[PDB]
Amino acid sequence: GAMPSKLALIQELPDRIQTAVEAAMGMSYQDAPNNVRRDLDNLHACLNKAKLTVGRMVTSLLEKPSVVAYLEGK
Amino acid sequence: GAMPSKLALIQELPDRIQTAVEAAMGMSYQDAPNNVRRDLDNLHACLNKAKLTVGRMVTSLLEKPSVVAYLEGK
């Protein structure tokens, strides 16, 4: 019976956001004109970048033992 | 029933990320000292921000008719 610790949450945030935008990443915008689908291409760069910023924001929490320990509850 | 189209996805992305991050927002980081929980405070500001950067990224796509129409399938 392992109730998820805050670190379970902070670590899963990347996966949650991966799931948050997997829909849009797997979106087939190629049935749209280049420019508008490029707006999805911007969604592709920036929203995937958004996962990138979040993943590493978690990394920013993960680069310090005290912060990490509190998340896991150590 | 309503099979989700690309617009259903782009519109739900905000809620998906609101969910991707709700766990961390509802996190009881006050269990930790000010500074380390402040590290979660940065997590809060930046992840709440992160949701909203996606909020505006969706808004970016949402503020042009060609882009929007292709998402919905108009």
What does the model show?
Chains A, B: It is found in: Host mitochondrion. Two copies of one chain form a homodimer. Chain A has helices at 6-25, 34-62, 65-72. With 74 residues, chain A is mainly alpha-helical. The first copy, chain A, has a single domain (1-74), classed as Helix Hairpins (Orthogonal Bundle), CATH 1.10.287.1060. In chain A, helix 1 (6-25) crosses helix 3 (65-72). Chains A and B meet through helix 1, helix 2 and helix 3 of A and helix 1, helix 2 and helix 3 of B.
Please indicate the count of domains of chain A.
1
- Protein chains sharing the most extensive interface: A-B, 38 and 37 residues
* Strand coverage percent of chain A: under 5%
Structural class, from secondary structure content of chain A? mainly alpha
Order of helices and strands of chain A: HHH
CATH 4th-level superfamily of chain A: ESAT-6-like
Oligomer: homodimer
The shape of chain A, in one word, is elongated
CATH architecture of chain A: Orthogonal Bundle
How can the largest sheet of chain A be summarized?
none
What is the CATH class of chain A? Answer: Mainly Alpha
CATH third-level topology of chain A? Helix Hairpins
Q: What level of helicity do the residues of chain A show?
A: over 70%
For the termini of chain A, the CA-CA separation is: 17 Å
Our Rg estimate of chain A from Cα atoms comes to 16 Å
Number of strands of chain A: 0
Number of helical regions of chain A: 3
PDB class: viral protein
Keywords: Symmetric antiparallel homodimer, all alpha-helical, Viral protein
Assembly: dimeric
Entry title: Solution structure of FHV B2, a viral suppressor of RNAi
